[PDB]
């Protein structure tokens, strides 16, 4: 599997035998927040 | 300028001191034909 990244565009891709397998965009993450990670309000407040 | 290809993906980049500058997609011309290249009918005559 050869991934290729594009530090311009940040953008990535990952081929197999020159097919393309995936693609999208991956970058480093400059100022995580750890609020993000708090978890959700439940759907369901109370399954008891 | 730095110039980066993907061929699984047939997208480009130029970038320039990892500054994005140019981007699309090219790919070799599988099927040239020339009737491509014929001059379209003007539309107005321009006869005089």
Known sequence: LEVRLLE???AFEV???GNLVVSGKVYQWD??????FDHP????????
């Open 8 to 10: 311009a565009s940040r």
């Open 31 to 36: 100022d995580p927040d750890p609020r993000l």
């Open 15 to 17: 081929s197999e035998n």
């Open 41 to 48: 309000e439940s759907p369901t407040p109370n399954p008891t």
